[PDB]
Amino acid sequence: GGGSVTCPGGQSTSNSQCCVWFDVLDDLQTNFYQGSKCESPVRKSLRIAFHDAIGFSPALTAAGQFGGGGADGSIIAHSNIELAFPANGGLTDTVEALRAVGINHGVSFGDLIQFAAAVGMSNCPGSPRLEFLTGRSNSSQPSPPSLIPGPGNTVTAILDRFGDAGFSPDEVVDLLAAHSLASQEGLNSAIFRSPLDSTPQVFDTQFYIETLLKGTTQPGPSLGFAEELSPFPGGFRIRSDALLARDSRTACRWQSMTSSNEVMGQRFRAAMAKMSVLGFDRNALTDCSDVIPSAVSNNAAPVIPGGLTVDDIEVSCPSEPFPEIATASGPLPSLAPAP
Numbered sequence: 001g002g003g004s005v006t007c008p009g010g011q012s013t014s015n016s017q018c019c020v021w022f023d024v025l026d027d028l029q030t031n032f033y034q035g036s037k038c039e040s041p042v043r044k045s046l047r048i049a050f051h052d053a054i055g056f057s058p059a060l061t062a063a064g065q066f067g068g069g070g071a072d073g074s075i076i077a078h079s080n081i082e083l084a085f086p087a088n089g090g091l092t093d094t095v096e097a098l099r100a101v102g103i104n105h106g107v108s109f110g111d112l113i114q115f116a117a118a119v120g121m122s123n124c125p126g127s128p129r130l131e132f133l134t135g136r137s138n139s140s141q142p143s144p145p146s147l148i149p150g151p152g153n154t155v156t157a158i159l160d161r162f163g164d165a166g167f168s169p170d171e172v173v174d175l176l177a178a179h180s181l182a183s184q185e186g187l188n189s190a191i192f193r194s195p196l197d198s199t200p201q202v203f204d205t206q207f208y209i210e211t212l213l214k215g216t217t218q219p220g221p222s223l224g225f226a227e228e229l230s231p232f233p234g235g236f237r238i239r240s241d242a243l244l245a246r247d248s249r250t251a252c253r254w255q256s257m258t259s260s261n262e263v264m265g266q267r268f269r270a271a272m273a274k275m276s277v278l279g280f281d282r283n284a285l286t287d288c289s290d291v292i293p294s295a296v297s298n299n300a301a302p303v304i305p306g307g308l309t310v311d312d313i314e315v316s317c318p319s320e321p322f323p324e325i326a327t328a329s330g331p332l333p334s335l336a337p338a339p
């Protein structure tokens with residue numbers, strides 16, 4: 001009930017509580033995203049959205065311990081503690097930028113983190129319009145350690161961690177679609193911002209396709225932590241991604257994610273919707289999704305690049321034949337570092 005309202009700025013929204021977010025939106029797009037760009041800040045933001053929310057463990061709670069508050073913005077309010085975690089390196093600068101936006105505009109760290117991620121993705125072509133709820137308390141307790149899955153973890157360990165959090169193997173695969181807009185800076189400092197897929201600025205299925213290709217080249221002088229050979233020069237491949245793409249428990253869902261950008265988009269949206277509210281009752285929050293702008297549509301079709309073919313794909317789903325995917329001519333492409 002209530003009805004649509006008009007904000008002070010003339011914008012139309014579903015609830016009055018959404019109005020303050022239009023100010024944050026202008027701030028982020030203007031400053032943080034340096035003109036609504038899809039570069040490092042967007043990737044850092046998405047990474048932070050995950051690392052804040054994932055600090056939620058029903059298992060710890062069942063053992064009589066604090067299991068973490070989930071998407072409570074603890075990674076910021078307790079950055080001194082959480083940024084010490086193995087998986088939270090290279091986030092400090094982004095955390096400080098977000099801390100200031102939240103403090104000034106007066107929005108909670110929890111809400112802001114999920115907001116920034118949704119807004120950031122709208123700057124990258126092909127991205128779906130993520131759900132955005134507001135109303136998370138700004139208060140939090142530091143996240144317990146060892147709750148973030150690591151690149152060197154076995155699939156069994158990764159599935160267990162996510163399972164505890166509330167995600168099925170299929171959902172973990174869906175969640176990894178975020179690596180379609182990713183690079184690494186801390187695994188191998190020798191090759192700064194080496195992309196995970198051939199399109200670090202396009203939310204597409206390229207990540208799922210290329211991760212299944214045979215690893216043939218080494219991007220840098222030496223291998224970094226949890227690094228595997230990749231298919232293209234300049235490209236990077238995380239061990240956990242390589243394993244998940246080929247493990248019988250996740251192989252078919254991963255393969256199903258290669259030919260359809262639309263299917264990928266909603267799967268990621270649904271999985272993200274659940275992650276963004278870990279540690280909260282979504283019914284206690286307010287839906288402000290209409291604040292999130294739409295992104296440019298991706299008209300490029302999925303493809304096996306560089307002259308490689310299905311024969312270069314290490315098909316891991318025994319029950320389904322690899323989908324029909326276009327191929328290309330020209331040589332093997334050299335991937336430039338993500339912007």
Ligand code: HEM
Nearest residue numbers: 043046047050149150151175178182183184185186187240
């Ligand atoms: C299942 C396990 C997952 C593992 C082991 C994992 C691991 C990693 C690692 C080691 C990096 C490189 C960090 C660096 O050295 O700069 C990375 C990057 C990234 N990850 Fe994941 N990740 C996982 C899931 C996710 C999820 C669920 C999301 C968000 C919805 C996400 C979003 C990102 C983004 C956007 C980057 C790129 C950062 C950049 O370009 O700066 N990841 N991830």
Ligand SMILES: *[C@@H]1O[C@H](CO)[C@@H](O)[C@H](O)[C@H]1NC(C)=O
Nearest residue numbers: 077102103106107108109138
């Ligand atoms: C949220 O908490 C931080 C300290 O953890 C504080 O600096 C900030 O002003 C708070 N934000 C709001 C909206 O009260």
Ligand SMILES: *[C@@H]1O[C@H](CO)[C@@H](O)[C@H](O)[C@@H]1O
Nearest residue numbers: 307308309326327328329
């Ligand atoms: C991709 O394109 C190349 C060159 O046309 C073929 O060799 C391959 O079979 C696939 O069609």
Ligand SMILES: *[C@H]1O[C@H](CO)[C@@H](O)[C@H](O)[C@@H]1O
Nearest residue numbers: 219233234334335336337
């Ligand atoms: C091919 O060229 C790109 C830059 O255009 C590099 O990033 C890659 O490592 C390889 O030298």
Ligand SMILES: [Ca+2]
Nearest residue numbers: 052055070074
């Ligand atoms: Ca948290």
Ligand SMILES: [Ca+2]
Nearest residue numbers: 180199202204
């Ligand atoms: Ca991509």
